[PDB]
Amino acid sequence: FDDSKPIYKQIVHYIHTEIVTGTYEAGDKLLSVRELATKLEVNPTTIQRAYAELEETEIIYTVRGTGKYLTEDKRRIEQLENDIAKQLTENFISEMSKLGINKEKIIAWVKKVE
Amino acid sequence: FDDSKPIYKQIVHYIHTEIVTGTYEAGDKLLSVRELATKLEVNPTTIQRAYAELEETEIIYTVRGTGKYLTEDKRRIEQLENDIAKQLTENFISEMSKLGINKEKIIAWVKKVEEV
Protein backbone atom coordinates (compact mmCIF):
# COMPACT_ATOMS: atom_id res chain seq x y z
CA PHE A 1 0.00 0.00 0.00
CA ASP A 2 0.91 3.63 -0.80
CA ASP A 3 2.72 5.31 2.11
CA SER A 4 1.02 8.69 1.73
CA LYS A 5 -2.80 8.06 1.50
CA PRO A 6 -4.91 6.59 4.34
CA ILE A 7 -4.71 2.83 4.47
CA TYR A 8 -8.49 2.22 5.03
CA LYS A 9 -9.34 3.83 1.68
CA GLN A 10 -6.82 1.59 -0.07
CA ILE A 11 -8.39 -1.46 1.73
CA VAL A 12 -11.82 -0.45 0.48
CA HIS A 13 -10.45 -0.25 -3.05
CA TYR A 14 -8.60 -3.60 -2.63
CA ILE A 15 -11.88 -5.33 -1.66
CA HIS A 16 -13.77 -3.50 -4.40
CA THR A 17 -11.20 -4.86 -6.89
CA GLU A 18 -11.64 -8.43 -5.61
CA ILE A 19 -15.37 -8.06 -6.13
CA VAL A 20 -15.26 -6.46 -9.59
CA THR A 21 -12.75 -9.04 -10.86
CA GLY A 22 -15.02 -11.82 -9.55
CA THR A 23 -12.49 -13.10 -7.10
CA TYR A 24 -15.56 -13.18 -4.86
CA GLU A 25 -18.87 -14.11 -6.39
CA ALA A 26 -22.22 -12.79 -5.15
CA GLY A 27 -23.00 -14.27 -1.67
CA ASP A 28 -19.44 -15.46 -0.96
CA LYS A 29 -18.06 -15.38 2.54
CA LEU A 30 -15.28 -12.78 2.99
CA LEU A 31 -12.30 -13.02 5.21
CA SER A 32 -12.83 -12.14 8.86
CA VAL A 33 -11.39 -8.84 10.19
CA ARG A 34 -8.49 -10.71 11.83
CA GLU A 35 -7.84 -12.91 8.78
CA LEU A 36 -7.61 -9.97 6.42
CA ALA A 37 -5.55 -7.83 8.87
CA THR A 38 -3.11 -10.72 9.13
CA LYS A 39 -3.01 -11.33 5.39
CA LEU A 40 -2.32 -7.72 4.56
CA GLU A 41 -0.20 -6.91 7.63
CA VAL A 42 -2.58 -4.04 8.50
CA ASN A 43 -4.15 -2.99 11.76
CA PRO A 44 -7.45 -4.85 12.52
CA THR A 45 -8.95 -1.48 13.32
CA THR A 46 -8.25 -0.31 9.78
CA ILE A 47 -9.91 -3.45 8.42
CA GLN A 48 -12.97 -2.96 10.63
CA ARG A 49 -13.23 0.64 9.34
CA ALA A 50 -13.01 -0.47 5.69
CA TYR A 51 -15.60 -3.25 6.35
CA ALA A 52 -17.89 -0.63 8.00
CA GLU A 53 -17.77 1.47 4.85
CA LEU A 54 -18.51 -1.54 2.65
CA GLU A 55 -21.51 -2.47 4.80
CA GLU A 56 -22.93 1.09 4.87
CA THR A 57 -22.78 1.10 1.05
CA GLU A 58 -24.67 -2.27 0.93
CA ILE A 59 -21.76 -4.18 -0.57
CA ILE A 60 -21.28 -6.56 2.32
CA TYR A 61 -23.50 -7.89 5.17
CA THR A 62 -22.52 -9.01 8.65
CA VAL A 63 -24.02 -12.27 9.94
CA ARG A 64 -23.51 -11.87 13.77
CA GLY A 65 -21.24 -14.54 15.09
CA THR A 66 -20.49 -16.12 11.74
CA GLY A 67 -18.83 -13.54 9.46
CA LYS A 68 -19.22 -11.13 6.58
CA TYR A 69 -20.70 -11.95 3.26
CA LEU A 70 -20.66 -10.27 -0.20
CA THR A 71 -24.04 -9.07 -1.24
CA GLU A 72 -26.25 -11.60 -3.09
CA ASP A 73 -27.58 -8.78 -5.22
CA LYS A 74 -25.95 -9.02 -8.64
CA ARG A 75 -27.30 -5.57 -9.55
CA ARG A 76 -25.39 -4.03 -6.66
CA ILE A 77 -22.20 -5.63 -7.89
CA GLU A 78 -22.88 -4.42 -11.46
CA GLN A 79 -23.48 -0.92 -10.00
CA LEU A 80 -20.14 -1.08 -8.17
CA GLU A 81 -18.22 -1.90 -11.36
CA ASN A 82 -20.08 0.82 -13.26
CA ASP A 83 -19.47 3.42 -10.59
CA ILE A 84 -15.76 2.69 -10.32
CA ALA A 85 -15.13 2.46 -14.11
CA LYS A 86 -17.18 5.58 -14.79
CA GLN A 87 -15.21 7.65 -12.30
CA LEU A 88 -11.85 6.44 -13.53
CA THR A 89 -12.93 7.19 -17.13
CA GLU A 90 -14.43 10.61 -16.36
CA ASN A 91 -11.29 11.60 -14.51
CA PHE A 92 -9.05 10.42 -17.35
CA ILE A 93 -11.06 12.22 -20.06
CA SER A 94 -11.05 15.34 -17.82
CA GLU A 95 -7.33 15.30 -17.45
CA MET A 96 -6.71 14.64 -21.17
CA SER A 97 -9.22 17.40 -22.11
CA LYS A 98 -7.31 19.87 -19.96
CA LEU A 99 -4.30 19.32 -22.20
CA GLY A 100 -6.49 20.10 -25.29
CA ILE A 101 -6.64 16.48 -26.50
CA ASN A 102 -9.92 15.72 -28.26
CA LYS A 103 -11.89 12.56 -27.90
CA GLU A 104 -10.63 10.97 -31.09
CA LYS A 105 -7.02 11.50 -29.98
CA ILE A 106 -7.86 10.21 -26.47
CA ILE A 107 -9.12 7.01 -28.09
CA ALA A 108 -5.94 6.91 -30.18
CA TRP A 109 -3.81 7.09 -26.99
CA VAL A 110 -5.83 4.27 -25.31
CA LYS A 111 -5.45 2.06 -28.39
CA LYS A 112 -1.75 2.69 -28.61
CA VAL A 113 -0.73 2.13 -25.05
CA GLU A 114 -0.23 -1.55 -24.02
CA PHE B 1 -4.12 22.60 -5.09
CA ASP B 2 -3.94 19.20 -3.33
CA ASP B 3 -2.07 19.57 0.03
CA SER B 4 -1.30 15.80 -0.14
CA LYS B 5 1.34 16.11 -2.97
CA PRO B 6 4.21 18.56 -3.43
CA ILE B 7 2.98 22.01 -4.34
CA TYR B 8 5.83 22.92 -6.73
CA LYS B 9 5.09 19.81 -8.80
CA GLN B 10 1.45 20.92 -9.06
CA ILE B 11 2.59 24.30 -10.29
CA VAL B 12 4.85 22.58 -12.80
CA HIS B 13 1.74 20.69 -14.05
CA TYR B 14 -0.34 23.86 -14.22
CA ILE B 15 2.34 25.53 -16.39
CA HIS B 16 2.72 22.41 -18.50
CA THR B 17 -1.07 22.60 -19.10
CA GLU B 18 -0.87 26.25 -20.27
CA ILE B 19 1.99 25.24 -22.55
CA VAL B 20 0.41 22.14 -24.13
CA THR B 21 -2.86 23.99 -24.80
CA GLY B 22 -1.06 26.92 -26.43
CA THR B 23 -2.17 29.42 -23.83
CA TYR B 24 1.50 30.23 -23.74
CA GLU B 25 2.83 30.03 -27.34
CA ALA B 26 6.38 28.97 -28.18
CA GLY B 27 8.84 31.76 -27.53
CA ASP B 28 6.43 33.79 -25.31
CA LYS B 29 7.53 35.78 -22.28
CA LEU B 30 6.25 34.16 -19.04
CA LEU B 31 4.96 35.80 -15.91
CA SER B 32 7.62 36.76 -13.30
CA VAL B 33 7.95 34.69 -10.13
CA ARG B 34 6.09 37.45 -8.31
CA GLU B 35 3.22 37.77 -10.87
CA LEU B 36 2.65 34.06 -10.89
CA ALA B 37 2.83 33.67 -7.07
CA THR B 38 0.06 36.31 -6.80
CA LYS B 39 -2.10 34.81 -9.51
CA LEU B 40 -1.91 31.33 -7.96
CA GLU B 41 -1.78 32.65 -4.34
CA VAL B 42 1.23 30.48 -3.47
CA ASN B 43 4.56 31.17 -1.89
CA PRO B 44 7.00 32.61 -4.44
CA THR B 45 9.68 30.09 -3.35
CA THR B 46 7.38 27.43 -4.72
CA ILE B 47 7.18 29.19 -8.05
CA GLN B 48 10.97 29.59 -8.05
CA ARG B 49 11.31 25.85 -7.58
CA ALA B 50 8.77 25.13 -10.35
CA TYR B 51 10.56 27.57 -12.73
CA ALA B 52 13.88 25.85 -11.89
CA GLU B 53 12.54 22.47 -12.79
CA LEU B 54 11.10 23.88 -16.04
CA GLU B 55 14.49 25.39 -16.89
CA GLU B 56 16.38 22.17 -16.08
CA THR B 57 14.07 20.25 -18.43
CA GLU B 58 14.58 22.84 -21.22
CA ILE B 59 10.96 23.96 -21.24
CA ILE B 60 11.81 27.54 -20.30
CA TYR B 61 14.90 29.71 -20.32
CA THR B 62 16.05 32.98 -18.77
CA VAL B 63 17.33 36.11 -20.46
CA ARG B 64 18.90 37.80 -17.35
CA GLY B 65 17.32 41.20 -16.66
CA THR B 66 14.64 40.78 -19.34
CA GLY B 67 12.60 37.73 -18.18
CA LYS B 68 11.69 34.10 -18.64
CA TYR B 69 10.52 32.58 -21.86
CA LEU B 70 8.90 29.51 -23.21
CA THR B 71 11.02 27.42 -25.49
CA GLU B 72 10.54 28.10 -29.15
CA ASP B 73 11.45 24.48 -30.00
CA LYS B 74 8.18 22.92 -31.21
CA ARG B 75 9.39 19.35 -30.95
CA ARG B 76 10.19 19.93 -27.25
CA ILE B 77 6.65 21.04 -26.58
CA GLU B 78 5.30 18.05 -28.59
CA GLN B 79 7.46 15.77 -26.43
CA LEU B 80 6.06 17.40 -23.25
CA GLU B 81 2.44 16.68 -24.41
CA ASN B 82 3.45 13.09 -25.32
CA ASP B 83 5.08 12.47 -21.95
CA ILE B 84 2.09 13.76 -19.98
CA ALA B 85 -0.54 12.00 -22.10
CA LYS B 86 1.44 8.72 -22.00
CA GLN B 87 1.56 8.72 -18.23
CA LEU B 88 -2.10 9.54 -17.89
CA THR B 89 -3.04 6.81 -20.35
CA GLU B 90 -0.72 4.15 -18.78
CA ASN B 91 -2.15 4.91 -15.33
CA PHE B 92 -5.76 4.72 -16.59
CA ILE B 93 -5.22 1.47 -18.48
CA SER B 94 -3.48 0.00 -15.39
CA GLU B 95 -6.31 0.88 -13.02
CA MET B 96 -8.98 -0.40 -15.42
CA SER B 97 -6.98 -3.57 -16.12
CA LYS B 98 -6.79 -4.30 -12.40
CA LEU B 99 -10.57 -4.37 -12.33
CA GLY B 100 -10.52 -7.09 -15.02
CA ILE B 101 -11.71 -4.76 -17.77
CA ASN B 102 -10.18 -5.70 -21.09
CA LYS B 103 -8.82 -3.26 -23.65
CA GLU B 104 -11.88 -3.44 -25.85
CA LYS B 105 -14.13 -2.62 -22.95
CA ILE B 106 -11.79 0.21 -21.82
CA ILE B 107 -12.18 1.71 -25.31
CA ALA B 108 -15.96 1.30 -25.05
CA TRP B 109 -15.95 3.18 -21.68
CA VAL B 110 -13.96 6.05 -23.15
CA LYS B 111 -16.41 6.30 -26.03
CA LYS B 112 -19.55 6.19 -23.91
CA VAL B 113 -18.58 8.55 -21.11
CA GLU B 114 -20.53 11.72 -20.63
CA GLU B 115 -17.77 14.30 -20.30
CA VAL B 116 -18.01 16.53 -17.22
Same domain membership, residue B93 and residue B54 = no
Q: Supply the CATH number for residue A30's domain.
A: 1.10.10.10
Same domain membership, residue B113 and residue B85 = yes
Contact (CB<8Å) B109/A86: yes
Q: Supply the CATH number for residue A93's domain.
A: 1.10.287.2110
Q: How far is CA A103 from CA A15, A107, A110, in A?
A: 32, 6, 11
- Residues in chain B with CB shorter than 8 Å from the CB of A95 are 88
Contact (CB<8Å) A99/B17: yes
Same domain membership, residue A100 and residue A68 = no
Contact (CB<8Å) A86/B106: no
CB-based contact, B26 to chain A, within 8 Å = no
Best B80, B115, B116 residue to mutate vs chain A (most A CBs within 10 Å)? B115
Same domain membership, residue A64 and residue A89 = no
End-to-end alpha carbon distance in chain A: 24
Task: List the domain range (segments joined by +) for residue A32.
Answer: 1-72
Resolution in A: 1.8
Nearest CA in chain A to B101: A21
Same domain membership, residue A92 and residue A60 = no
Nearest CA in chain B to A20: B99
Q: What is the DSSP letter of A29?
A: B
Cβ B50 vs Cβ B15: under 8 Å:
yes
- Rounded Cα distance, A24 and A30, in Å: 8
Number of domains in chain B: 2
DSSP A44-92: HHHHHHHHHHHHHTTSEEEETTTEEEE-S-HHHHHHHHHHHHHHHHHHH
Same domain membership, residue A89 and residue A78 = yes
Cβ B59 vs Cβ B71: under 8 Å:
yes
Same domain membership, residue A45 and residue A91 = no
Same domain membership, residue B44 and residue B6 = yes
Contact (CB<8Å) A101/B85: yes
Nearest CA in chain A to B16: A99
- Rounded Cα distance, A48 and A36, in Å: 10
Q: Is A24 helix (H, G, I), strand (E, B) or coil?
A: coil
Selection from B107, B17, B81, B20 nearest residue A89 by Cα:
B107
Same domain membership, residue B54 and residue B4 = yes
Same domain membership, residue A54 and residue A83 = no
Same domain membership, residue A78 and residue A68 = no
Cβ A109 vs Cβ B85: under 8 Å:
yes
Contact residues, B window 45-84, toward A, CB-based 8 Å cutoff: 81, 84
Same domain membership, residue A77 and residue A54 = no
